[PDB]
Specification:
Number of helices of chain A: 1
Shape of chain A: globular
Number of strands of chain A: 3
Chains A, B: Transcriptional regulator, AbrB family
Largest sheet of chain A: 2 strands, antiparallel
Assembly: dimeric
Keywords: DNA binding protein, transcription regulator
Strand content of chain A: 25-35%
Structural class of chain A: mainly beta
Oligomer: homodimer
Entry title: The DNA-recognition fold of Sso7c4 suggests a new member of SpoVT-AbrB superfamily from archaea.
PDB class: transcription regulator
């Protein structure tokens, strides 16, 4: 797998460098989903099609 | 677990609403780690102590 390091110091947010964006998809104007798990203690995000109605 | 919906349409980034921040820790000035998996196809992020040297 791949791993990167980042630090929060602006407004509680993240922009994801270019390396991660290179592996994952992340498309401008797409529906991204985020879920919190009660076991690993990490946030998982993914992508899917796009509804328009 | 918990789930939320978001859309990319600013500059390929995310700020995470308040609900997710309520469950996860996310501290201003902390070391957050992000890794890409080659099986689930999702990004996992967590938190850890802070080195100062």
């Amino acid at each position: 797998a791949v791993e990167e390091i980042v630090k929060v110091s602006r407004n509680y947010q993240v922009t994801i460098p270019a390396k991660v964006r290179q592996k994952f998809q992340i498309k401008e104007g797409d529906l991204v989903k985020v879920t919190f798990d009660e076991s690993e203690g990490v946030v998982k995000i993914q992508l899917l099609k796009e509804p328009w109605k």
